[PDB]
Amino acid sequence: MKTPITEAIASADSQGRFLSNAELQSITGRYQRASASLEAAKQLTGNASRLITGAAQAVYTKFPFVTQMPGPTYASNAIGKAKCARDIGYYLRMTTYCLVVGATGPMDEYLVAGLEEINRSFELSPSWYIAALENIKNDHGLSGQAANEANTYLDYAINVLS
Amino acid sequence: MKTPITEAIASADSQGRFLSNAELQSITGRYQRASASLEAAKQLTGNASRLITGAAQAVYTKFPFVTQMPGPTYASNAIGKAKCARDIGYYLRMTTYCLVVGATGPMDEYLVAGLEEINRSFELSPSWYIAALENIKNDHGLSGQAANEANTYLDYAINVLS
Amino acid sequence: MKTPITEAIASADSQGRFLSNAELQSITGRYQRASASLEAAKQLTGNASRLITGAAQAVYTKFPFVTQMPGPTYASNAIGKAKCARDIGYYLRMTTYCLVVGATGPMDEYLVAGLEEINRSFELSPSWYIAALENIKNDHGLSGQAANEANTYLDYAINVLS
Amino acid sequence: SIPVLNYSLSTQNQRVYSFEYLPNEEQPKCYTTDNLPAAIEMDQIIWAAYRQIFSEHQLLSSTRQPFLESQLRFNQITVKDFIKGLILSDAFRYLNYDVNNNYRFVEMCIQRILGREIYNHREKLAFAVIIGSQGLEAFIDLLINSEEYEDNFGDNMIPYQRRRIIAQRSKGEIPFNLKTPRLGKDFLYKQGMPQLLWAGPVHRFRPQEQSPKAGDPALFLSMVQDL
Amino acid sequence: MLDAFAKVVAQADARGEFLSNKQLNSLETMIGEGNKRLDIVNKINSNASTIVTNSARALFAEQPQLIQPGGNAYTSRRMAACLRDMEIVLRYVSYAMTAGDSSVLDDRCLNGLRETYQALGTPGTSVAVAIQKMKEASIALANDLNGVPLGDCSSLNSELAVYFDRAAAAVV
Amino acid sequence: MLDAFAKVVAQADARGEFLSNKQLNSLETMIGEGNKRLDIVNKINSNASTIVTNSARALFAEQPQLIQPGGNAYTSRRMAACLRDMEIVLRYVSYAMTAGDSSVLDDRCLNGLRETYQALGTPGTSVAVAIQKMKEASIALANDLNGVPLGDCSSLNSELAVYFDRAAAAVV
Amino acid sequence: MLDAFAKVVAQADARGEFLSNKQLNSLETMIGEGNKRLDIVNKINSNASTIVTNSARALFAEQPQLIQPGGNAYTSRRMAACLRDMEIVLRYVSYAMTAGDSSVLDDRCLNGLRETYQALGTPGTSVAVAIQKMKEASIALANDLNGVPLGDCSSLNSELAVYFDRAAAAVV
Amino acid sequence: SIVTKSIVNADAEARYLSPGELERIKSFVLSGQRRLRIAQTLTENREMIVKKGGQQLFQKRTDVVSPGGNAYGEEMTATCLRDLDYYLRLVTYGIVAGDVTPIEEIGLVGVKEMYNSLGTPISGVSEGVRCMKDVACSLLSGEDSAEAGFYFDYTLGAMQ
Numbered sequence A, B, C: 001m002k003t004p005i006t007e008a009i010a011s012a013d014s015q016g017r018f019l020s021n022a023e024l025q026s027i028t029g030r031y032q033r034a035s036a037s038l039e040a041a042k043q044l045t046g047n048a049s050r051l052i053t054g055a056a057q058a059v060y061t062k063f064p065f066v067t068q069m070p071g072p073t074y075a076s077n078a079i080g081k082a083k084c085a086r087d088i089g090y091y092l093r094m095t096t097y098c099l100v101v102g103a104t105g106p107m108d109e110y111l112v113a114g115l116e117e118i119n120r121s122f123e124l125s126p127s128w129y130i131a132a133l134e135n136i137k138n139d140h141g142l143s144g145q146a147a148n149e150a151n152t153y154l155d156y157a158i159n160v161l162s
Numbered sequence D: 001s002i003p004v005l006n007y008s009l010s011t012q013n014q015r016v017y018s019f020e021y022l023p024n025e026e027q028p029k030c031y032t033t034d035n036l037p038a039a040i041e042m043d044q045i046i047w048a049a050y051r052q053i054f055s056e057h058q059l060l061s062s063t064r065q066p067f068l069e070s071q072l073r074f075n076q077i078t079v080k081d082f083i084k085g086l087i088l089s090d091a092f093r094y095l096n097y098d099v100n101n102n103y104r105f106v107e108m109c110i111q112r113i114l115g116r117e118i119y120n121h122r123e124k125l126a127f128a129v130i131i132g133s134q135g136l137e138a139f140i141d142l143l144i145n146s147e148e149y150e151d152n153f154g155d156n157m158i159p160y161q162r163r164r165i166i167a168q169r170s171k172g173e174i175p176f177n178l179k180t181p182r183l184g185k186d187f188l189y190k191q192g193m194p195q196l197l198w199a200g201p202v203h204r205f206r207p208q209e210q211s212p213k214a215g216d217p218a219l220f221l222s223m224v225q226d227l
Numbered sequence E, F, G: 001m002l003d004a005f006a007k008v009v010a011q012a013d014a015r016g017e018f019l020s021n022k023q024l025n026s027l028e029t030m031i032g033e034g035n036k037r038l039d040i041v042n043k044i045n046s047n048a049s050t051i052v053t054n055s056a057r058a059l060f061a062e063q064p065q066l067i068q069p070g071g072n073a074y075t076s077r078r079m080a081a082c083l084r085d086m087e088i089v090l091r092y093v094s095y096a097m098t099a100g101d102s103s104v105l106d107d108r109c110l111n112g113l114r115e116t117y118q119a120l121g122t123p124g125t126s127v128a129v130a131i132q133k134m135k136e137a138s139i140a141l142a143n144d145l146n147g148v149p150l151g152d153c154s155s156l157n158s159e160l161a162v163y164f165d166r167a168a169a170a171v172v
Numbered sequence H: 001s002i003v004t005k006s007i008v009n010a011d012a013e014a015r016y017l018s019p020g021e022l023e024r025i026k027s028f029v030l031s032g033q034r035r036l037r038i039a040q041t042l043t044e045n046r047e048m049i050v051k052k053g054g055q056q057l058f059q060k061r062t063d064v065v066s067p068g069g070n071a072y073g074e075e076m077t078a079t080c081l082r083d084l085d086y087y088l089r090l091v092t093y094g095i096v097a098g099d100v101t102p103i104e105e106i107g108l109v110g111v112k113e114m115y116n117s118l119g120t121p122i123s124g125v126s127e128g129v130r131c132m133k134d135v136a137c138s139l140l141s142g143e144d145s146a147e148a149g150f151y152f153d154y155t156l157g158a159m160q
């Protein structure tokens, strides 16, 4: 998985080389941001539930047709609502992982790769989740550097779906 | 030139990718060590002369045949002494560069590449320079983390010549 | 451009080969279906206008939020509504091209390649156009083999967008 | 069977020993199958090979090959066979082959697979004959089974641009996909030249009176800002 | 590559129009005559080797320059390269006879070729004489009333002679 | 490739000297302001898609040439190529914003490129207008006083505008 | 690709004749002296590194430009590139000394020296001085009356100084 | 100018200026500030008139910027807009002069011989000046753009 650490060891390994002072400086810089990263990671875990329910609700309010169309894909059933909260839950989970790891490696591994084929075969628009993530980016409640750590990744997923 | 910075740019260039948060953490870590790096860099420039002279003198005291061997390659002339101090001057220069840049990139570019073929074609001995660098490593007079920043690179050149 | 003809010539070119009996059989088979293909091609061109306007109307009736959503990407403007009929006109155009040529080569060249990146970067839902093509497929008014020649390619575009 | 004619030979960078003990940078990442990479690093190899042949522009979803990926990830082929079956894939033929004037497709093959510029014009001549008769297949067979390609990439490595940047100097050589882009200078000439290119000239307008003349101080301004 | 059809569609799309009924009617006429075209291409392919070698005999018989030493037919490798180049040009004339439009013949073979037989010191005028030795033979086999029902094919032989004249005009 | 540092050390070694005290002190000032630099590059990357697509909307809205059928945005495929070229130039401007020196932007992207958009018949003047549509947007997101403490960033914003002006000056 | 023999055979066949008795007799004389040629190539190979390094000492001693910073011998890596390029040109002179004809020297090493250097900002005139430092030493070891009994080899030293002068004339 | 035309007129009649012509000079010198306002506005709005008039020209007339056209290419289009800039400048000169003499002698005397020697369709030039007339009438008042617009109309009558 792409961490800063595995990235630096991978590069120095590909150059057939010991870890010089450069890569050790990089790992240092991972450690001296990691505290803000974990403060951001604990508050997201600390109120993950309400972020999900509020996110799905915001998606419903912006797109009123989703709760009204008589189709399997749309959240007009008792199933698409649960599955709607399921998917939003997945994204919030991955963001918390990337805040712990320190790069976008977990989201790029477990989530980003192959997502076009899912959203193409199951007729799901890119925006729905965009709207969800915009609500989470507006209402995570972090402050300062922890908020930069969260908004980086939450913006990043929006850059993926757009 | 291999910096931390150009390393990060180079890796995310090879992945066809923007800079994420990982690379920025690396650049952070370069900046948060750079002050001790410059304290180390200023004092070596501040007394580089006496380090050179002391170093060449130590090379002579360890290897007494050098000042006595009749040859082109040996400092028994008035030429190999000045050229001896010339090369020692070069090593110390490259160490001060690497302390400013923050990796071994200047030494790997300007000094390390192809040096075995020079020391093979010109009958030069790796140990001579090894002895010089040992004296510099013993007598630079830095203290604390600046001394670790000097001794890292000074050791690194010894790892190259051995 | 992929025709039947350039397919056969391309294969026999890659084999370093004259046109044998096989490719001549292929071009025969193109000639003996081309009549129905052109009958289908004439009627679509003959009333393309009402097909476009009916199609955009059907997209509006299925998706009423599109005519109501304030944004640049939605047909709530005079301009948004105008563009909509532009793109539906493009789909009908490419189907008439493929009916004339006898393969999906004009649609695969001019239309299909890179379509995901457009519908990802400009937030265009795959379904809108799906609904448009469903109306075209239901209301072209052909009969018999001409209708199969139209519905092959009209189905084909839906297989592309899904 | 009429072998390839004897051609000349030039002197480029790829035939010297830049010893470079302990590589600075710029050494193209070793994206292979030898290091037993997991799922991600497999995806990075797959993307790096795609960029290499197709390049960034032709790496779109329609162009992408699922099946040779699924075979490669499972060990059913070598990377060399992946690069080969890549070039034989027809989406590469509709774009980069049907456009290119036969002598020019020889550039992008000897140059996108071997990572070196052509020695002289005669090379383009000979290799364009063998792709003109045997087909694209046996030409790519010639390049891949060649002694050169086995000598430096072996069985599982994505080809790279060899020695693009000399030690220390920044400039070096222009990147490869940049160098031979696709369309070509004279390909259009035979058809209608691209119509309706005027508006870019309209959006940018300078009065003739504003334009610098010889001997003014302003012409040298750029030099002053670089010092 | 482009056939007869994709040229019309390529122009029409490059201007961004539908095909009018007039273009469709003429295109119906082309489809209604396509059998004759396949017949000619059959009669070329099934005699193609013989065409090439007989035109080679004629060429070297009338110009005894090239084989007697110093010329380009002299070396065995060159002699064989010469023959197969004649086969190449015949191959692309057969392709452009099927496709209807001089498209595959004008980008893969002819375009750049005159430049190539000036990098090798080869007389492209002698190449044009070789193509003039293939045109006569090819038309002479095209007009064989044998195995095929009677009809009118002058309007298509006038479409075959154009390509052979275009190659001879383009290597010089 | 060279950053801020390696340029100074490359000049100093190319003359073969130590670094004087004056160079070290200015270099200390650059290190002492480097958080702002990281902040800008963070605010570009995390909005990069939006920058690209909004500048594309502006571009094709103001010049409706390109997407009409005979232009370069017309082909759906060409259209995608157009967009991702904008993404590319934005990527290298972000790299050269981090490194401080226009080194990676002047060898890997801009060098050779004006030659390339003359081999494709692409209006490079229109490309420079696209870059002028990205500069505006990128600086307008760079100067967002939001989540970031208050302070002075004109000395850096100006530096940012250098690179976008350099790409526009170099594709034309 | 053509030794001294294959050039004569190539001329004779290019005219398409038998080899006349005059060519055969001179060729007999060449074979009758070819042991001395092998002896000289032995005396070059077995001292080649020493030749190179001694001519390098001479070069940098006479022109102190190159090593003091700003020149081309100043970089450690560039220093070694200087030496190796001298090794390259000595290698190909050894090749063309064995073959008798400047064929391998005129296609494998001669073609890329002028173009590459002027692209490296290297004084090719100084390269030619390096080759003039190698010609002296190489002939001085070729004329070593040691280990081999005496004979006449000025006739063959002329044949060796041609190649060294050809490389010096061709990097400039 | 009007002064030049009157002086030349009574000069060839070898007399002083009549009262009718001196009243004409009075009306001219009192109408001055209005003229200078108009040429001031067309001066400071030149890039809008050249750009927008060039857009309406090339959109109405896709001949000359098509392949094989007189202006096909970046350099040629730039030269085309350069000439529209020239005729805009000359219209402003004719406005401050109060007479078409500045326009005629700088720009119109032997224009057809020049553009016929360049291969340029002069009807395209007249359509360009008409396009700049539409833009410049969009930038002014009623009577104001009547006056200036009629200077443009003189230039169109000289091209056609």
Ligand SMILES: C=CC1=C(C)[C@@H](Cc2[nH]c(/C=C3N=C(/C=C4\NC(=O)[C@H](C)[C@H]4CC)C(C)=C\3CCC(=O)O)c(CCC(=O)O)c2C)NC1=O
Residues within 6 Å of the ligand: A056, A059, A066, A071, A072, A073, A074, A075, A076, A079, A080, A081, A083, A084, A085, A087, A088, A090, A091, A110, A111, A118, A122, A124, A128, A129, A132
């Ligand atoms: C690892 C990451 C990961 C994800 C992010 C999800 C993404 C995802 N969602 C669905 C599938 C689904 N996702 C939704 C969600 C939606 N309902 C709506 O009203 C909204 C538009 C939207 C929530 C915002 C629905 C309704 C389905 C079922 C669609 C259907 O069957 O019609 C599927 C297909 C398989 C399935 O049915 O579950 C996948 C892969 N799955 C993953 O493995």
Ligand SMILES: C=CC1=C(C)[C@@H](Cc2[nH]c(/C=C3N=C(/C=C4\NC(=O)[C@H](C)[C@H]4CC)C(C)=C\3CCC(=O)O)c(CCC(=O)O)c2C)NC1=O
Residues within 6 Å of the ligand: B056, B059, B066, B072, B073, B074, B075, B079, B080, B081, B083, B084, B085, B087, B088, B090, B110, B111, B118, B122, B124, B128, G060, G067, G074, G075, G076, G079
């Ligand atoms: C940038 C990095 C850099 C280096 C690492 C040196 C390496 C180097 N040293 C020498 C050359 C030399 N180096 C020395 C140095 C000395 N020999 C002794 O016996 C003493 C112990 C020792 C001084 C302490 C001497 C005397 C020579 C000249 C003769 C020789 O080869 O020994 C040369 C050949 C050119 C010359 O004569 O100057 C080179 C490339 N030069 C560089 O530019």
Ligand SMILES: C=CC1=C(C)[C@@H](Cc2[nH]c(/C=C3N=C(/C=C4\NC(=O)[C@H](C)[C@H]4CC)C(C)=C\3CCC(=O)O)c(CCC(=O)O)c2C)NC1=O
Residues within 6 Å of the ligand: B142, B143, B144, B145, B147
């Ligand atoms: C009463 C007299 C008296 C002394 C003379 C000191 C001496 C002393 N210093 C350290 C220990 C130390 N002393 C220093 C000081 C510094 N190291 C650097 O590199 C800087 C240049 C320098 C500050 C200017 C440091 C950093 C340590 C801990 C690590 C080390 O050994 O360097 C220790 C070990 C115990 C400890 O970690 O504190 C002792 C005994 N202590 C005393 O009580």
Ligand SMILES: C=CC1=C(C)[C@@H](Cc2[nH]c(/C=C3N=C(/C=C4\NC(=O)[C@H](C)[C@H]4CC)C(C)=C\3CCC(=O)O)c(CCC(=O)O)c2C)NC1=O
Residues within 6 Å of the ligand: C059, C066, C071, C072, C073, C074, C075, C076, C080, C081, C083, C084, C085, C087, C088, C090, C091, C110, C111, C118, C122, C124, C125, C128, C129, C132, F057, F060, F067, F073, F074, F075, F076, F079
């Ligand atoms: C060659 C084929 C080809 C196509 C098929 C189109 C596809 C396409 N449409 C748009 C762009 C667009 N397409 C639409 C169309 C829509 N309006 C709606 O209300 C509906 C959902 C939908 C019609 C059914 C709109 C509104 C835009 C502009 C979107 C925006 O700027 O917000 C763009 C981006 C460039 C532009 O702005 O024009 C592209 C590539 N273009 C091509 O070159």
Ligand SMILES: C=CC1=C(C)[C@@H](Cc2[nH]c(/C=C3N=C(/C=C4\NC(=O)[C@H](C)[C@H]4CC)C(C)=C\3CCC(=O)O)c(CCC(=O)O)c2C)NC1=O
Residues within 6 Å of the ligand: D005, D102, D124, D125, D126, D127, D128, D129, D130, D131, D132, D133, E066, E071, E072, E073, E077, E078, E079, E080, E081, E082, E083, E085, E086, E088, E108, E109, E110, E113, E116, E120, E122, E123, E126, E127, E130
């Ligand atoms: C697709 C289009 C296409 C072409 C236009 C040719 C062009 C071409 N011809 C040759 C190569 C050649 N072409 C010929 C042909 C002949 N030389 C003579 O003196 C005769 C007059 C003449 C036959 C009539 C010969 C003999 C060679 C090999 C030697 C030479 O260069 O002359 C080569 C070099 C490769 C090779 O040796 O085959 C190329 C690229 N090849 C193609 O694939």
Ligand SMILES: C=CC1=C(C)[C@@H](Cc2[nH]c(/C=C3N=C(/C=C4\NC(=O)[C@H](C)[C@H]4CC)C(C)=C\3CCC(=O)O)c(CCC(=O)O)c2C)NC1=O
Residues within 6 Å of the ligand: C021, C024, C025, C028, E035, E036, E038, E039, E040, E042, E142, E143, E144, E145, E148, E149, E150, E151, E152, E153
């Ligand atoms: C796969 C390969 C393949 C071929 C090579 C053709 C061969 C072929 N030609 C015809 C049929 C025909 N072919 C010709 C052609 C001719 N007109 C003349 O003046 C000339 C003598 C000659 C062209 C050189 C004509 C005129 C007919 C119709 C004959 C008739 O109905 O009288 C038929 C009978 C079916 C039909 O009417 O089309 C067939 C099988 N068909 C194939 O499937």
Ligand SMILES: C=CC1=C(C)[C@@H](Cc2[nH]c(/C=C3N=C(/C=C4\NC(=O)[C@H](C)[C@H]4CC)C(C)=C\3CCC(=O)O)c(CCC(=O)O)c2C)NC1=O
Residues within 6 Å of the ligand: D055, D056, D057, D058, D175, D177, D178, D179, D181, D182, D183, F066, F072, F073, F078, F079, F081, F082, F083, F085, F086, F088, F089, F108, F109, F113, F116, F120, F122, F123, F124, F126, F127, F130
């Ligand atoms: C490393 C740096 C780097 C770049 C900067 C690009 C530059 C570049 N662009 C293209 C290619 C292209 N670039 C564009 C872009 C354009 N579309 C338009 O409407 C505008 C004029 C313009 C965007 C502003 C298009 C449309 C193509 C495809 C052209 C075609 O095939 O007709 C190609 C040829 C290969 C390909 O098809 O992708 C190259 C090398 N590539 C690189 O490797």
Ligand SMILES: C=CC1=C(C)[C@@H](Cc2[nH]c(/C=C3N=C(/C=C4\NC(=O)[C@H](C)[C@H]4CC)C(C)=C\3CCC(=O)O)c(CCC(=O)O)c2C)NC1=O
Residues within 6 Å of the ligand: A033, A144, A145, A148, B024, B025, B028, F032, F033, F035, F036, F037, F038, F039, F040, F042, F142, F143, F144, F145, F146, F148, F149, F150, F151, F152, F153
């Ligand atoms: C790894 C990622 C990473 C980042 C993204 C930055 C984020 C960052 N910015 C600042 C700090 C700051 N950031 C800005 C930036 C600006 N303020 C303005 O009003 C302008 C809108 C904007 C122009 C760029 C300023 C002015 C400061 C405070 C001054 C300073 O610390 O130099 C700090 C200091 C600590 C703190 O404030 O708590 C940090 C860590 N650093 C990192 O390590």
Ligand SMILES: C=CC1=C(C)[C@@H](Cc2[nH]c(/C=C3N=C(/C=C4\NC(=O)[C@H](C)[C@H]4CC)C(C)=C\3CCC(=O)O)c(CCC(=O)O)c2C)NC1=O
Residues within 6 Å of the ligand: G035, G036, G037, G038, G039, G040, G042, G142, G143, G144, G145, G146, G148, G149, G150, G151, G152, G153
């Ligand atoms: C396969 C490699 C190979 C070689 C390299 C030679 C080496 C060689 N040279 C000689 C023999 C000889 N070589 C020379 C050459 C010399 N004359 C001089 O003036 C110079 C010092 C020198 C040329 C530079 C002479 C003169 C003899 C004959 C010596 C004698 O008989 O006195 C002999 C003994 C057999 C003979 O008489 O030919 C051999 C083995 N032979 C080989 O088979």
Ligand SMILES: C=CC1=C(C)[C@@H](Cc2[nH]c(/C=C3N=C(/C=C4\NC(=O)[C@H](C)[C@H]4CC)C(C)=C\3CCC(=O)O)c(CCC(=O)O)c2C)NC1=O
Residues within 6 Å of the ligand: D011, D012, D013, D014, D015, D016, D017, D018, D166, D167, G066, G072, G073, G078, G079, G081, G082, G083, G085, G086, G088, G089, G108, G109, G112, G113, G116, G120, G122, G123, G126, G127, G130
């Ligand atoms: C097959 C034949 C063949 C050659 C003949 C060489 C020629 C050659 N030399 C260099 C490159 C070089 N060559 C030299 C040599 C010189 N140093 C000086 O002081 C002298 C002027 C001169 C020796 C006489 C140097 C110094 C470089 C590196 C130049 C630089 O990077 O600044 C390069 C560029 C690639 C590289 O850096 O190695 C090439 C192609 N290479 C080949 O493949």
Ligand SMILES: CCC1=C(C)/C(=C/C2=NC(=C\c3[nH]c(/C=C4\NC(=O)[C@H](C)[C@H]4CC)c(C)c3CCC(=O)O)/C(CCC(=O)O)=C2C)NC1=O
Residues within 6 Å of the ligand: H064, H065, H069, H070, H071, H076, H079, H080, H081, H083, H084, H086, H087, H106, H107, H118, H120, H121, H122, H123, H124, H125, H128
């Ligand atoms: C002040 C009075 C004055 C005028 C007007 C003038 C015009 C003038 N127009 C020129 C060219 C040109 N002018 C045009 C103009 C056009 N092409 C079209 O299709 C359109 C109809 C039209 C633009 C509206 C073009 C295309 C050329 C260059 C043609 C060529 O060089 O092939 C040149 C040739 C060299 C040069 O420009 O420097 C002159 C001198 N010179 C003068 O002294």
